[PDB]
């Protein structure tokens, strides 16, 4: 009877597999490719300036 952390490896593999499934689904439906027509909108984001003192 030596020491044992097989349940630790199973738990860590379960965490890795569940996180890989969720992140694969999110990176599947957020960086998809639009088809035959192109990007149907535009980003249009612009940043203006401010008056920032320097004390």
């Amino acid at each position: 009877n030596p020491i044992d952390l097989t349940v630790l490896a199973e738990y860590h593999k379960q965490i890795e597999s569940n996180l890989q499934r969720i992140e694969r689904k999110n990176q599947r439906t957020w960086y998809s490719k639009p088809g035959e027509r192109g990007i149907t909108c535009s980003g249009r984001q612009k940043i203006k300036g401010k008056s920032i003192p320097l004390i």
Binding site: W30, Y31, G43, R44, Q45, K46
Partner: protein
């Protein structure tokens, strides 16, 4: 534009090289007031974290 009553005369220097004097009747009848339309967008971005 719009058509207005104009006198050609030097009036106290307020029209020195090419300046124009305007009476407040042109303001109160708001007959050069102009509507402007700006546009601003905002996107939700898939960053990390």
């Amino acid at each position: 534009g719009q058509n207005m009553r104009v006198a050609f005369m030097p009036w106290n220097g307020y029209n020195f090289e090419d300046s124009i004097l305007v009476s407040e009747r042109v303001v109160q009848e708001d007959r050069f007031t102009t509507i402007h339309i700006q546009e601003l967008a905002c996107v939700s971005r898939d960053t990390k974290l």
